[PDB]
């Protein structure tokens, strides 16, 4: 009859970058969703197949809690059935999703003022990713018949680029802090 | 990604002592720079680590008075210097990289 | 969407002189995603800067990119007789966009 | 400081067809979102481009009140960016939509022992509908070559379907009532308010 550590996760001084995104593993705890949701310092929290108000009514095996930093235009992404950069190659939710999206403007957080590209995103990919796939891979992405083999120039690039996060930037080119909630034998995790 | 550090250093108590960390492969200012130390027969213990763009470092408790983490970032180095060494202070010392909170200290 | 607004539809001047291309954007802006193009008169456009201040290989020094947020300029320190051909400009959300385009002639 | 009438649309007690929805037009008066959403009566609850709990200290110049009757499987259409039948033929969002997606179970109102066929939904359309689009034209849908001329047969078919809608059906065969409330913009003067 622990409380579970969700403000461990959300008010975390440093996130992760999306393509090298985290997972907390939530057990054997109690959690009040409302208390979170009436919060309302959020810009979106958006649940898929389950309602917010009447979460605090249910349980689960698991719920594991995903969060990043992204882009303002690209919060849009981390929903089922989306295409772009980050929903095909950093982070896709699947279809039977069941859980919901958090996000809120952290530009007083993660902004530096000459630039703070310590977050980063994955451009260049062979293919998308499955549902909460994870790649860490830094091989160089080979566009030409010609292989690579570890050496940027003509047809080979890096894979990942930096988010040019300045506090002047464009509100939709700012930074967003997001947590993804999953919701998933007897439960554990309850209210 | 590479780190190599600086070779051995032999000192008496009271001299003073500075490791040098060069790093390559990366973008030096993007991640952090945290230092562990493991004494003889003990486990690694945490010393702390220096923003690599900000500059700020952070002292674990038991580091602070008589170390300092720095850089240059002229030659992607992060350095340790401790003042007033003492005989307790004999141990390997390791930099280490933290890509996230996630992939903390995956580099040595 | 974003939409790109050059400046001026056309600009006159003569060989040697120093051409200052404007390319305006319709909101709030990345400096990571705006390229130049040159297109000579029935040839395919030639990426000349990308980012935002970046020569793209095979571009000469006389050419020169800056800006940030909502405005952004190619420069062409000095020109020569093949500088004279039209110029768009390119910004990126989830889709590409380009400029109306400036012809650049002999004055 | 008339208080709006989210009670007339959300406790209508017949709704409409998913390919006649209503545009139920709100002005002039204040809307208390908080207690729309606490009520905790909703299966689906989705806002997009705002928050919801943030929704009272907010202003719009109009709200748009749309509200149909479709089965729970495509509750997830009625979202910016999906496909399928209700998403495409039916009702579209766009994918700058800015409101708010709110549905629930309606299987022991919007269902009859021996089947009720009242509700409707469109089939087959030569094309996607446009963001905001209602088609109410009953007009014979052509496959072939062959034109119809308003009588039924091969490549020849009535554009519209009946939803079976019956209390022994699967939850995802269930009707759902949903209610989408747009939000617009300033620049113009703003009438609704919390
Ligand atoms: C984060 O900290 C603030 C201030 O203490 C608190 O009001 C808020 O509830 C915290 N968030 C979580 C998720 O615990
Ligand atoms: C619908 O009616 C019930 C019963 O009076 C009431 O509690 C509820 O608030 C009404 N819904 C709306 C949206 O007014």
């Known amino acids: 009859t622990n409380l579970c550590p969700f403000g461990e996760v959300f008010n975390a001084t440093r996130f992760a970058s999306v393509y090298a995104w985290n997972r907390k593993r939530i057990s054997n705890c109690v959690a009040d969703y409302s208390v979170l949701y009436n919060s309302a310092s959020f810009s979106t929290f958006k649940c898929y197949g389950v309602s917010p108000t009447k979460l605090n009514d249910l349980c689960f095996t698991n719920v594991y809690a995903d969060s990043f930093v992204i882009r303002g235009d690209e919060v849009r992404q981390i929903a089922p059935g989306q295409t772009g950069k980050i929903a095909d190659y950093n982070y896709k939710l699947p279809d039977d999703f069941t859980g919901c999206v958090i996000a809120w403007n952290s530009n007083n957080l993660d902004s530096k003022v000459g630039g703070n590209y310590n977050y980063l995103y994955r451009l260049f990919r062979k293919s998308n990713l499955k549902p909460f796939e994870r790649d860490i891979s830094t091989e160089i992405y080979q566009a030409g018949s010609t292989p690579c083999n570890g050496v940027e120039g003509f047809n080979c690039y890096f894979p990942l680029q930096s988010y040019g996060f300045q506090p002047t930037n464009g509100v939709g080119y700012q930074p967003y802090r997001v947590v993804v909630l999953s919701f998933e034998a007897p439960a554990t995790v309850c209210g | 990604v590479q780190l190599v550090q600086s070779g051995s250093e032999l000192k008496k108590p009271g001299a003073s002592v500075k490791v040098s960390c060069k790093a390559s492969?990366?973008?030096?200012?993007?991640?952090?720079m945290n230092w562990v130390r493991q004494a003889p027969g003990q486990g690694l213990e945490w010393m702390g680590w220096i923003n690599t763009n900000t500059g700020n470092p952070t002292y674990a408790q038991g580091f602070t008075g008589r170390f300092v983490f720095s850089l240059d970032t002229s030659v992607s180095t992060a350095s340790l210097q401790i003042s007033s060494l003492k005989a307790e202070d004999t141990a390997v010392y390791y930099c280490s990289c933290e890509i996230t909170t996630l992939g903390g200290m995956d580099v040595w | 969407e974003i939409v790109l607004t050059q400046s001026p539809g056309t600009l006159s001047l003569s060989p040697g002189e120093r051409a200052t291309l404007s390319c305006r954007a319709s909101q709030s802006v990345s400096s990571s995603y705006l390229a130049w193009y040159q297109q000579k008169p029935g040839q395919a456009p030639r990426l000349l800067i990308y980012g935002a201040s970046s020569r793209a290989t095979g571009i000469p020094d006389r050419f020169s990119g800056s800006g940030s947020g909502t405005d952004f300029t190619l420069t062409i320190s000095r020109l020569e007789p093949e500088d004279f051909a039209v110029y768009y400009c390119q910004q990126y959300g989830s889709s590409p966009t380009f400029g109306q385009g400036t012809k650049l002639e002999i004055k | 400081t008339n208080l709006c009438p989210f009670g007339e649309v959300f406790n209508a007690t017949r709704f409409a067809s998913v390919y006649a929805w209503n545009r139920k037009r709100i002005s002039n008066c204040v809307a208390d979102y908080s207690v729309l959403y606490n009520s905790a009566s909703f299966s689906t609850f989705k806002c997009y481009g705002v928050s919801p709990t943030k929704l009272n200290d907010l202003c719009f110049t109009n709200v748009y009140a749309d509200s149909f009757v479709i089965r729970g499987d495509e509750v997830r259409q009625i979202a910016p960016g999906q496909t399928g039948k209700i998403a495409d033929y039916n009702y579209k969002l766009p994918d700058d939509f800015t409101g708010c997606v709110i549905a629930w179970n309606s299987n022991n109102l919007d269902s009859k022992v021996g089947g009720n066929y009242n509700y409707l939904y469109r089939l087959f359309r030569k094309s996607n509908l446009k963001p905001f689009e209602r088609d109410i034209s009953t007009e014979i849908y052509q496959a072939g070559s062959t034109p119809c001329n308003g009588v039924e047969g091969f490549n020849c078919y009535f554009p519209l379907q009946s939803y079976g809608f019956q209390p022994t059906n699967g939850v995802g065969y269930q009707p759902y009532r949903v209610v989408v409330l747009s939000f617009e913009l300033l620049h113009a003067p703003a009438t609704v308010c919390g």
């Open positions: 492969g990366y973008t030096f200012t993007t991640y952090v």
